[PDB]
Amino acid sequence: SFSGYLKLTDNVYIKNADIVEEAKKVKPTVVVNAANVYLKHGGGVAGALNKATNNAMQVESDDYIATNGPLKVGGSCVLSGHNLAKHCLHVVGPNVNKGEDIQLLKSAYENFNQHEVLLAPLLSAGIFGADPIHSLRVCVDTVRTNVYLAVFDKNLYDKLVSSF
């Protein structure tokens, strides 16, 4: 199971950890990917999860987009978790560096409520340009299911916990 997490609320937990390493250790039912609408897993969390699958996540993702078209910002899709989890929930948070509306961050976190328990990153943080403190607050105020957040930066983890 999940270990070494700090409990923030009745249902939100947080740890300073690499989500790829956490997925390989736990093999959760659901791992969330910080996806873009095209499912092009080039960098950040998406690039790291895809590299751990030996590119099998990208091959599956390109077939999904060829059939269905792109996702919406704030939307999601369920695909295989490959060697990392039973399933991967690909969720698109708004990328502020592309001028996407930050209000769509709450819609993105609502996708988590369709799963009883998930391993996830903070949406729209990092190269998506949003304030991580804001992302954690939207997470706690929107997600009702059990979410285990992996934040791979000790300095940011300490700032998130000390300001919570």
Ligand SMILES: CC(C)[C@H](Nc1ncnc2[nH]ccc12)c1ccc2c(c1)S(=O)(=O)CCC2
């Ligand atoms: C540095 C943290 C803010 C964090 N990094 C991480 N958090 C957890 N496992 C990780 N493995 C490798 C890095 C990594 C973070 C959280 C969310 C997002 C990104 C980064 S991003 O990939 O830059 C863009 C998408 C959203």
